[PDB]
Amino acid sequence: KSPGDNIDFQTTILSRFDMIFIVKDDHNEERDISIANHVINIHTGNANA
């Protein structure tokens, strides 16, 4: 479906912004592993230091 259909308002509102960022959640083994490692590292306290 078109990005205009995905939103829930008049499509002319999108004409007002300067930059648009449609971020998608694609599934990937290595990216999931990397993000999980990052998050548990943050929670443990290493990324704090």
Partner 1 sequence: LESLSNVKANSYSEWITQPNVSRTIARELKSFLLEYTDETGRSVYGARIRTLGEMNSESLEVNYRHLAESKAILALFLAKCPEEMLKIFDLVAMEATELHYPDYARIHSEIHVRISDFPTIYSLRELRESNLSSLVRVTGVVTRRTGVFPQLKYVKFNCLKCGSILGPFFQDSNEEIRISFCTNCKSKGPFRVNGEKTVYRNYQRVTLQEAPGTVPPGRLPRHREVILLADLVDVSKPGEEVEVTGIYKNNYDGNLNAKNGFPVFATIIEANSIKRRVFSWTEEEEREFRKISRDRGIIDKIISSMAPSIYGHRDIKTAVACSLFGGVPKNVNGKHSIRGDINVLLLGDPGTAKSQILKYVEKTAHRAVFATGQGASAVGLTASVRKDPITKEWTLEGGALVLADKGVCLIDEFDKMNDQDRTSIHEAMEQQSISISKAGIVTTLQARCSIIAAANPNGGRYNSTLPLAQNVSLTEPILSRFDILCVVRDLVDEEADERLATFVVDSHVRSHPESPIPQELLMKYIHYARTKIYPKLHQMDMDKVSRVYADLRRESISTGSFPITVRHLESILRIAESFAKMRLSEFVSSYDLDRAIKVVVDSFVDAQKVSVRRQLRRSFAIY
**Which residues lie near partner 1 (CB under 8 A)?**
25, 27, 29, 32-33, 35-37, 39-48
Phi/psi for 21 (5° steps) reads -135, 100
- Between 11 and 34, name the residue whose CB sits nearer to partner 1: 34
CB of 49 to partner 1, least distance (A): 10
Choose among 21, 16, 19, 13: nearest CA to 4. Answer: 13
CB of 14 to partner 1, least distance (A): 21
Nearer to partner 1 among residue 15 and residue 48 (C-beta): 48
The token duo for 43 is 């929670």
Give, for 41, the enclosing helix (H) or strand (E): helix 29-44
